[PDB]
Description:
Layout: H1 4-11, E1 14-19, E2 22-25, E3 27-28, H2 34-54, H3 59-64, H4 67-80, H5 82-86, H6 89-96, H7 100-107, H8 111-115, H9 117-129, H10 133-136, E4 146-154, E5 162-163, E6 166-170, E7 174-182, E8 190-193, E9 196-199, E10 201-203, E11 206-213, E12 226-233, E13 239-249, E14 261-262, E15 266-271, E16 280-286
Parallel strand pairs: 6-13
Antiparallel strand pairs: 1-2, 2-3, 4-7, 4-15, 5-6, 5-14, 7-11, 8-9, 8-12, 10-11, 12-13, 15-16
Helix pairs in contact: 2-4, 4-9, 6-7, 7-9
Amino acid sequence: GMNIFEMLRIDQRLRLKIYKYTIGIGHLLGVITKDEAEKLFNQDVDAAVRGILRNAKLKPVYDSLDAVRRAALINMVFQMGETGVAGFTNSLRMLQQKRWDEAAVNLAKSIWYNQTPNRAKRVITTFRTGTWDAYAAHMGDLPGIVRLSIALRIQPNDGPVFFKRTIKLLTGSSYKVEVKIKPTTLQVENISIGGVLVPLELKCRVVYTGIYDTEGVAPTKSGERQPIQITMPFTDIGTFETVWQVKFYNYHKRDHCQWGSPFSVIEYECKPNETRSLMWVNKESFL
C-alpha cells in the first residue's frame, strides 16, 4: 500500500521554519507545527492532482497510467508545478504510449535530473517499472538531514590543500582535521582516512577536530591516483562512508601540493536510515 504521500515523505525534507522561500514538506511561498505541516502537505498533494486533472497536456497521460506510475507524475508536479511538468512533451508522449524504457532514458537527459539526480532516478525507476523498487531501501529513512563538512589543513602553517577531483596529499606530514556536523546533537569519536585513525574531540554546527598523520603512507605510483576510504561512525544514527580519490607525494615531489585548485572544505548532505548498513550520501560539494 505504498503511495505518493510516503514517496514524497522520502523525497522531500520536512522543515518547520521558513527556508529558501519554502516551508513544510516543500511548500513554496514563521514557524509551523508538525500537524500544520502535515495538513499543508496533504493540501499540496491535492493541489498537484487537481493541477494534473485541469491540464489538457497532463490529464490524458495521468488517466492512462496505473496507480504507481501516476504517483511518479504527481511527484514531479509536486516538485516543479503543473506548468513545468506539462513542458515534458516528449517524455509525456512516451509514457502515454507505454514506451517505458524510452521515457526513462529521455527523462534522465533533463536539467531536472541534473539538479536533483537521486530523486529523479527514483521517480524514473517508478515510471519505468510501475513498482516501488527504488523506495524499498528508503523504508526507514529518518526524517532529518545530516550535514557534515570535512576540512584539512597542513601543519605547521595551516596551509591549504589542493585538488587536480583528485586530492593532492603529502606523505610524512600532519594535517589538522575539522569536522562540522549539523544537527549539533550528533556525536562522533573518530574518522578513518585511508586506514589512518583520527580521534576526534569536540571543541567550542558542532565542531570536532583531530590530527591526520601521513607518516608511513606510501606515495602513489606516478601517473596513478588511488581511492582512500573515509569512514566516520556516529553514536546512534549509523556510519558515514565515502571514498576520496587522492595522490600522495613524497618530499621531493612536495611542490605538487603547493599548486592547484584549493578546497577549504568538502560538504556532504546525508540521510540516516534505521537499518541500512551506511547512511545515504546524497551530495558532495568541494568548496
